Amino acid sequence: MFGAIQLDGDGNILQYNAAXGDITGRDPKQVIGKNFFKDVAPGTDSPEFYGKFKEGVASGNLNTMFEWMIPTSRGPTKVKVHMKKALSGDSYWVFVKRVKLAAALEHHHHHH
Ligand SMILES: COc1cc(/C=C2\SC(=S)NC2=O)c(OC)cc1O
């Protein structure tokens, strides 16, 4: 099971998946139509995240791969976020997969 969020150049939700909806606890249509950075995740709205998304949009190829934190009622949840421009060239998809559990060997440096 993987998560996929289809957003537009404006930063709105166009297509939502069920997986993400279950992991987050929000319906697809409930989030679709509104801003995922303003409505869904108002806190995520930052120059490091949103700023990067916009830049890629203007260039016509947003390629970013990193990890993000998702604070929930059951505690924080570390997931790997990846934003890649659409294939048609008129949209953007965001892949979110729950990273591995507490590993032993040194990894995920520069932990926030
Ligand atoms: C509700 O759905 C999502 C939420 C978040 C993040 C949040 S929510 C919050 S509060 N603080 C975050 O960083 C997310 O991050 C990649 C994906 C989702 O599909």
Structure description:
- The protein has 112 residues and is α+β, with helices and mostly antiparallel strands.
- It has a single domain (3-98), classed as PAS domain (Beta-Lactamase), CATH 3.30.450.20.
- Helices cover 23% and strands 33% of the residues.
- It is built from 4 helices and 5 strands.
- It has a 5-stranded antiparallel sheet with strand order 2-1-5-4-3.
- The chain binds the ligand COc1cc(/C=C2\SC(=S)NC2=O)c(OC)cc1O.
- The modification S-(4-hydroxycinnamyl)cysteine is found at residue 43.
- Monomer.
- Keywords: Chromophore, Photoreceptor protein, Receptor, Sensory transduction.
Describe this structure in a few short sentences.
It is built from four helices and five strands, in the order ββααααβββ. The protein is of the alpha+beta class.
Structure keywords:
Beta-Lactamase, 112 residues, 33% strand, identical protein binding, Photoactive yellow protein, five-stranded antiparallel sheet, receptor, monomer, alpha+beta, binds the ligand COc1cc(/C=C2\SC(=S)NC2=O)c(OC)cc1O, 5 strands
Q: What is the terminal-to-terminal distance?
A: 26 Å
Contiguous helical run count: 4
Q: Please compute the radius of gyration using only Cα atoms.
A: 14 Å
The fold-level CATH name is Beta-Lactamase
Bound molecules: the ligand COc1cc(/C=C2\SC(=S)NC2=O)c(OC)cc1O
Numbering strands along the chain, what is their spatial order in the largest sheet? 2-1-5-4-3
> Could you give a short account of the major beta sheet?
5 strands, antiparallel
Encode the helix/strand succession as letters. EEHHHHEEE
Shape: globular
CATH class identity: Alpha Beta
Approximate helicity band: 10-25%
Report the strand count. 5
Q: How many distinct folded domains?
A: 1
Q: Estimate the strand proportion.
A: 25-35%
Please name the CATH architecture: 2-Layer Sandwich
Question: What structural class do you assign from the helix and strand content?
Answer: alpha+beta
Under CATH, the homologous superfamily reads: PAS domain
